[PDB]
């Protein structure tokens, strides 16, 4: 995988979709559509449509953004240390594009890991699952229930 | 008419339009495809659909972004002094959202009126002549 | 209350003074010279001068920033959900000018009641005790 | 001459004078106070306090900044071309600290060499005549 230029990017995703995944803008809190979507599907990053969560995965966690236990799989996501006043924190990257996704936080529920993806909608791009086999995601469609 | 609100406007605009008409950024020289389009039609706001340029007005000025001799009416546009790098230019916006479109020089040919209004191309939407009905430009038509 | 225009405080605040109180940024970990200061006095909100915080309540753990464990009244500081970074933090603002000054944690002294006050130092100006009578802020110097 | 650390220069540059400066910012035209002084002395960088311009060359150009024939030295300013649209200009930065001044212009008095140095006040600091002996620039006083 190639990540589209900067150039390309800049005409092709919408100043949020840009503003997210290139310079790591979070979201307003509670905007984005999937943040109460639990429909059947998978969560793909919105630059490369790499999957990245299903939505076997996702609960509303009342945080403001799209909640998800784990990645879809273990290799789609990068994790990444950035710190305000010193304090830690875990940011979420794609594998393939290297989109900022959101964070990831130890306090999860414990029964599904422990983790808590928190992203932002902006970086995503939301799969039905009777859409998945046209869309060339029909592999994957056994993740989502 | 009303402007999106800022938070449409990002969720609705590429990166490249937000950044020009909101923020007034430039683009990079001969990159849009109307600096090198020359076809009958109407320019709109990207952010609005209001006209703004005939492309009767547009020329080749041959220095990287598209350019116009006026606005498709003298009320299409407004003007603002930028007073950007210790000089006084001739910022161009649209009317009915301000979507930064460009500036204004006083270096065009005098024979079609002296003025070179260098606006790019992110700001705007080209409605192709046969589109124009269509679109609702109809009564536009004339101005070619 | 008015607050200067954003133009006079341009030409009066410092850069760091402006970024942190009207952009929200944060200045570096140990670059303030109030990061280990224990004069006694008070700090004001550098824009109105509004008293924010005590020297009594300020304490030093090493931490990058000036730490209090609280303000000098309930109400001269304001209190705003930060959804950075996909949580949820509580931004710690001045009430009369909204200035930002930091963020409040529930990790401070538990004897005090648990809370840190960590506020850039570029938030603040600090009055000395001494000269708190002829500043006008004799009436607090009991805080101190 | 000397270029503080960026920490220094936020701490102690206004917001307005660290961004003309060091982020090449330009202020209003017209706002600044030495856009209308003509008072024998000499203009230092405001960071470094390196001499830049001398009273002797400065004029009223209209413009809305200080406006001057030449730098005060050769050596004391740096001249760097940039563009919008195409269309060139030439930035004028200090030697020794490396601060953003203005711009230059082609278009000044002829029988003083033709050029316009068109500089933000933000960037200067004036040192009046009367106080160029005790201020250390003695040696540059034949130059007012």
């Known amino acids: 995988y190639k990540k589209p230029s900067d150039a390309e990017l800049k005409?092709?995703?919408?100043?949020?979709?840009?503003?997210?995944?290139?310079?790591?803008?979070?979201?307003?809190?509670?905007?984005?559509?999937?943040?109460?979507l639990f429909k059947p599907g998978i969560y793909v990053d919105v630059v490369?449509?790499?999957?990245?969560?299903?939505?076997?995965?996702?609960?509303?966690?009342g945080c403001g953004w799209p909640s998800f236990t784990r990645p879809i799989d273990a290799k789609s996501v990068t994790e990444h240390d950035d710190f305000s006043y010193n304090m830690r924190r875990t940011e979420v990257r794609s594998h393939a594009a290297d989109s900022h996704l959101g964070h990831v936080f130890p306090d999860g529920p414990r029964d599904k890991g422990g983790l808590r993806y928190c992203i932002n909608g902006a970086s995503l791009?939301?799969?039905?699952?009777?859409?998945?086999?046209?869309?060339?995601?029909?592999?994957?469609?056994?993740?989502v229930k």
Do not use: C, W
Request: hydrophobic share 25%; glycine share 6%; aromatic share 14%.
């Open 11 to 36: 005409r092709t995703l919408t100043e949020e979709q840009y503003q997210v995944t290139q310079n790591s803008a979070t979201e307003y809190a509670f905007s984005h559509e999937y943040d109460h």
């Open 48 to 61: 490369s449509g790499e999957p990245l969560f299903s939505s076997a995965d996702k609960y509303d966690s």
């Open 125 to 143: 791009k939301f799969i039905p699952l009777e859409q998945m086999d046209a869309a060339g995601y029909g592999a994957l469609k056994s993740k």
